[PDB]
Structure formats: C-alpha cells, structure tokens
Amino acid sequence: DNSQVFGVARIFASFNDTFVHVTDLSGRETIARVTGGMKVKADRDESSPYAAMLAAQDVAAKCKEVGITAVHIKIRATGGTRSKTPGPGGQAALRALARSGLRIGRIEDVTPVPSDSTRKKGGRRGRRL
Amino acid sequence: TSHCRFYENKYPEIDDIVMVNVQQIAEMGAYVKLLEYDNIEGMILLSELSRRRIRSIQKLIRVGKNDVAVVLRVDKEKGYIDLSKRRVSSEDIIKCEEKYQKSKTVHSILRYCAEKFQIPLEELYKTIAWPLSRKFGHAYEAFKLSIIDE
Amino acid sequence: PKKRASNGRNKKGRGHVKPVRCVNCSRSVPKDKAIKRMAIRNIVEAAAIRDLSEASVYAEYALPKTYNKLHYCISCAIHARIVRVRSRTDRRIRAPPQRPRF
Amino acid sequence: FVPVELATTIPVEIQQAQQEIKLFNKWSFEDVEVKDASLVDYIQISKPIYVAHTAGRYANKRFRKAQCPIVERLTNSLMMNGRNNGKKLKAVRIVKHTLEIINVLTDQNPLQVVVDAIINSGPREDTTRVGGGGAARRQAVDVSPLRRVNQSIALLTIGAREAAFRNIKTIAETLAEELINAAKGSSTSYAIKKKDELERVAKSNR
Amino acid sequence: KTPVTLAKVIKVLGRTGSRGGVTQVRVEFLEDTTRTIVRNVKGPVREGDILVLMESEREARRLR
Amino acid sequence: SKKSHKDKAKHAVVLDQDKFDRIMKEAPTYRYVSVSVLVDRFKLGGSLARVALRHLENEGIIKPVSKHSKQAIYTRAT
RNA sequence: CUCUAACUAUAAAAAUCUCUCUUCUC
Ligand SMILES: [Mg+2]
Ligand SMILES: [Mg+2]
Ligand SMILES: [Mg+2]
Ligand SMILES: [Zn+2]
C-alpha cells in the first residue's frame, strides 16, 4: 500500500432514489449517508443522474474531510424479487465519485439474487398500468 | 406606508415557510410579492406549483390572495427569492397560517401610530421590534400581558 | 386460424411448464413463451471508462461486467421494443436478426 | 492630409483622410473587439461599413446571417411590433442617435459598448418543454452561439420597446440606457434580468 | 464561483427531441483537448464552433 | 376604469425664478441633457423643455453635436 | 482456401354517434 485510506462506496441504485452510502472496510462504520433525494427538490427526479451526481460530490467532499481517498465500490440494485436490474442513478453517482479526486479499486456487483424464493408481488396477470 | 418587514431582517432565511400574495403570471410560473417577509418578489415555478397535474392554472393560484408555501433558496446580494409551494407538511400548513395571521396582527397594530402621528413607519417599527419579536415568542402574548400588566 | 405452427409457445411435448414472472409487468407466463434476452453489459459505459481509469489504482483493471437474463413477458416485450411484429412470410425465420453488430 | 481638387468637392469631414473606414465618421471598427472568445465569428465587425444599411441577401442559406454586420442586425430588429414594420430609415436614425448617446455618456467607442452588452446579455443555458403529457416539466439544455446572439439582441430591442411605450423618454435614449445597463453586470437592465432568470430556470431544472 | 467552460464541437450527432430543434453534439473541451463529451444544445450549430457550458459534469442523453 | 393610475400633475410647464436658477446651475455637471432627460428631473413639463434647452444654447453653456428633429444631442461645455 | 466480441433508457387522461343501400346485356 501507498499509505492509502481505503473505503467502500457500495452504491444502491433502485429505479427511484439512488443511494450512496460509504462505510469502512468492516462495513459497520458509516460515512456520508447522503443520498440522491437529499440533493433534488422534486422528490421524483431522485432516480435521475443529477441527484446521484450531487450526492456523490458531497460524499467525496466528506471523504476528503475524513481522509478516505481510495474506494472499493459495491454497486447494488434492489434485486431479489424486484427486477434484478441496476438503476440509472447509481452509475452516474459512481462516475461522479470517479471524477472528484478519489481513487477506485475492485468495483463489485453485490446485487442480492434469490434462488426462486418469495412468491412475489403482482398477481397472476401482473402489473396492469 | 406598508413596509418595514415583520421580523428581524429584510431578507428571508433558508428553507423557511411563508404565505404569499399573487400579482401576475408571465409564462413560466409567477414572480409574486410576499406579505410574510419583505416585499421583494419571490418566484414560483410550475414544476413546484400544483399537487394535481397541470391542466388548469388560473384556479389553483387565484391571483390576488394568500397562499401557503415555503422558500427554497434566497439571494441576499441584490434580491431574488426562489419559492416553492408543494413540499409543505399538512401539519406545518397550520403553522404557516397562524404565523401569517400573527404577523398580520403585528402589521395592523404598528400602523395606527405611523398614521396618527405621521412619523416614519420604518423608524417606529425598528424602535419597537427589538423587545417585540425576539424576546421569547410572538408579540401578541406580550401585548396581552402589557394590557393586563404593562 | 393457425397463426404459428409451433403455437408461439415452444413447448411441444412437455404438457406443462413452470411459470416465470415478467421483469417489468410482473405477469406469470410459461417459461418457454417468456421471451428471454441475455443482457450482458459492461458495468460502466465508455463515457466513464476513462474517468474511472485515471482515477484507478491497479492500472489496466479488468473492469468486471454485469450479466443478467431478462425474462420479459410478451406484452412488455412488444411494448418495450424488444420484440417486433414482423410480416407473415418473415415469421418462419428463427435466426437472430443478422449479427446485431458487424 | 491629401485634399483632392474636384469640380464638385465633397466636404472635408467626408473627404480628407477617411481610408480608415468608419461607421458614422466618428467611431472606429479598429480598437473594438469581442471580449468573450465564444461569440466571435458570430458578431461580424470584421468588414468596415460606412452606413448600417445594405441590400444584403443574408437569409438565403442557413448561416449567411452571421455575415450581416451586428449593428445592421440591431437596426433591423429594433423596428419590431412593426406598425413601424419596414421604415428601416427611422430605425437607422434611432440607432445612430443611440450610438451618439453612448459616445456622450461613458464614450468607450459605443461599438465596444454594443459588443459588451451583447456578450453580457446572451443566455448560456436554456430550457425546453419535452416532458410528455403526464409530468409536464421543463428540462435544461445548452444554448447555441447564434441562438445566444439572437436572444441577446432581440431581448435588448424588446426592452427598448418596453421602456419606450407611452413614455416621454425617446426610444433612442431608452435603448441607449439599456446598453449602458447591459455593458456592465447591472441588474437594472431588463435584458440582463431576463438573461439571469432564464439561466436560473435552466440551473434549477437540470 | 465562475467555472465557465468552453468546448468545440467536432461532430454533429443529428438532432434529438420531440420538438425536433435540439442537437446532440460531441464537443471536445478547448482546455484538456484529449477529453470529449456529448451534450444537448438548443439553437443552430455547425462543427468548428465553440460553445459555452455552465456545467461540464453532466452527460446528455436523448431528450424524450 | 379603476383609480389605479394615481398620477399627479408631476410637471410645471413654465419656469419660475427658482427653477430658472436650478436649470442654470445644474446645466453643467450633466454630461448629457435631452428633451426627455430634462423632463426626467421634474423641473419642466416638456414642451418648454426644448425651449429651455435652445435657450441654454445662447452663450454656449451646452454644446450641440447632433441637431436632428425630435432628438438633439447636447453635452456640457468645458 | 484459416476466424468465435460490445451493450442502453418512455407506458397520464380520451365516453358517446341518424335516416339511406340500390342497376349489365351486346
Ligand atoms: Mg397498455
Ligand atoms: Mg385473430
Ligand atoms: Mg417465443
Ligand atoms: Zn411484462
């Protein structure tokens, strides 16, 4: 190591209100819980890339204040029962973290996936929007 | 002269709740005066206007009335107010109503002197407002205590 | 009338198939008539591969990818442009539409 | 300096040493430039002109508009709400009087004042109504250089109009004062005010 | 803060938007010419122009 | 319709001795004075404003540079 | 006559409808 302060970004990117929540290597001690909805006013563009980008920039400022420079991102979607698909905001949050000085390492896909559990929501014919 | 803002300073603070008076609508939204803070114009954007979908606009703004809202960002350099109507709690709406009525009562009280003695309203309100609003609460309780014991 | 010889199902000898739930509309549908797309994707796009690269220790990273197998319904698939209504004589061509990227 | 003998002599101020072509024989197309590097090639001060009115065929193609002198474009856009439509002669005299006024108050070669007002008055980020049906909301977009220039100039002339209407103040003076207010970042200018409002509606609705 | 940025378009990426008036453009920044970004611009554009951006972080997709 | 104009007289069309002195004193220190610039300072109605302007062009208090109808450009002399 | 690589992203609302229907051999 080059005397680095490693961290984990572990982005959670649903289809609404992208989450950015950095913690230590132990994963227990949280830093900069600020999310996408924190930085947008509509309460509905929370999934938009702008919310995630501003959240990531504020996280980066907090990390520079606390010394964490290089990161280990754990990209997450809602997964499980819900669509198994990454949200649009989380990727933009990851890019914004990449820009603002910080360094990356070992980006991970930590999407929780079931082995056909949980007879899940929707009914037979499913969504009828 | 209806002037000389109710509270300590002319320029509204951040994320603060107000009730506003509507005067005109150009095309985007409406930059309308305020009777909760100093009379500097505060502008509402249509994205932050109606809880229901935007199909009729003249019935929800009702130009020339009092409407509860909350100011998002304030420009204290030369005077621009970004003002928002939607994200207001159903329980804080009562807070806005009561606070606006209290400030209205203060305005009504401290106008009689300025018009009876033709002295500056701003000067008299500046003299009176130091023990008035900042002591520990609104003026009305202080005025009632004073009439029962000055 | 017989629209498709294979009944548009692709079961033909199983009697019953285990249903699967659509990714978007959440409709239960037989797993064979559950039009399926292997969404194999790089975890970030080319507009950010650079941004991540110069902000990366461990030069020339493998940049791990994300894989998924989307089990659409048919209504979502036709609505969300995955499957297209083709002409009568062109239905009988089951090859993928000619090398998406060449 | 080189007075020329003729059977009919054009007067001295028009005849003496004017191989330095001037707009109205008082202001130089030299010593004036575009302060912002972005808008260059779209504020055409390169070609010297003696009268801000030419039989220009400046709308046949997509981008022959940028070859029109900026002063001439201001003249043609000055006369909107064209009860005065046509009547470029009076527009030319209005803008010429405006240039004289700008020369009087803080001279600074009024050509440079016009350029500075254009630079400070053209919005840089705008919005567009592309929200489909349900969530009718407006989204941010960047502004093209020519679009920036046209918005600046039209906003300036419409501000001159709003000042001039049913007002003792003459439109030459109104437009001149708008150019003083727009040369600096003064908020009293109507054009700068609308520019800032549009910039903010773009900023907030990214 | 005045973080105004300048970028020269190198390729016009057709025209996007339901209105049919907004252009996608691939602009390389005048500063740090090695980097390119695609953004939306309202108004007439041609390659070789230089355009002004208040923000340079935002990547612009199709406007639906 | 409504009494919203609330416009006062706002003008004295014919000068007095006091306004005569104010005009002849504030004639300099103004780089530019026009008909409506003179109207702006409330000291004249405006029809006599140009009368006063040309009457300040008697001993060269204010030099003229352009003499077009409805718009003449006058700058203080030094 | 030797060839197995690249990807994006929308579902607001929208009901109803009167006559009068008939003619081809050289
Ligand atoms: Mg449907
Ligand atoms: Mg059928
Ligand atoms: Mg099938
Ligand atoms: Zn489906």
From TrEMBL, chain C:
**For binding Zn(2+) 2, which residues are annotated in this chain's numbering?**
22, 25, 73, 76
Q: What Pfam families does UniProt report for this protein, alphabetically?
A: Ribosomal_S26e
- Enumerate the InterPro entries for this protein: Ribosomal_eS26, Ribosomal_eS26_CS, Ribosomal_eS26_sf
**Which positions are annotated as binding Zn(2+) 1?**
22, 25
Q: Where does Zn(2+) 4 bind?
A: 22, 76
Task: Give the keywords, sorted.
Answer: Metal-binding, Ribonucleoprotein, Ribosomal protein, Zinc
What assembly does the database describe for this protein?
A: Component of the small ribosomal subunit (SSU). Mature yeast ribosomes consist of a small (40S) and a large (60S) subunit. The 40S small subunit contains 1 molecule of ribosomal RNA (18S rRNA) and 33 different proteins (encoded by 57 genes). The large 60S subunit contains 3 rRNA molecules (25S, 5.8S and 5S rRNA) and 46 different proteins (encoded by 81 genes). eS26 interacts with eS1 forming part of the mRNA exit tunnel. eS26 interacts with TSR2.
Protein name, as recorded: 40S ribosomal protein S26
Organism expressing this protein natively: Kluyveromyces lactis (strain ATCC 8585 / CBS 2359 / DSM 70799 / NBRC 1267 / NRRL Y-1140 / WM37)
TrEMBL record, chain D:
Q: Extract one GO molecular function annotation from the record.
A: structural constituent of ribosome
* Residue span, Small ribosomal subunit protein uS7 domain: 47-206
Q: Which UniProt keywords apply?
A: Ribonucleoprotein, Ribosomal protein
Coiled-coil ranges per UniProt: none
One Pfam family named in its UniProt record: Ribosomal_S7
PANTHER family in alphabetical order: RIBOSOMAL PROTEIN S7
Protein name as it appears in the record = KLLA0D10659p
Q: What is the organism field in this record?
A: Kluyveromyces lactis (strain ATCC 8585 / CBS 2359 / DSM 70799 / NBRC 1267 / NRRL Y-1140 / WM37) (Yeast)
From TrEMBL, chain F:
Could you say which residues of the full protein are shown? 28 to 105 of 108
Task: Provide GO CC annotations from the record.
Answer: ribonucleoprotein complex; ribosome
The molecule here is called 40S ribosomal protein S25
- Asked if the record carries the keyword Ribosomal protein, the reply is yes
Regarding protein family, the annotation reads:
Belongs to the eukaryotic ribosomal protein eS25 family.
Keywords of the record = Ribonucleoprotein, Ribosomal protein
Source taxon at top rank: Eukaryota
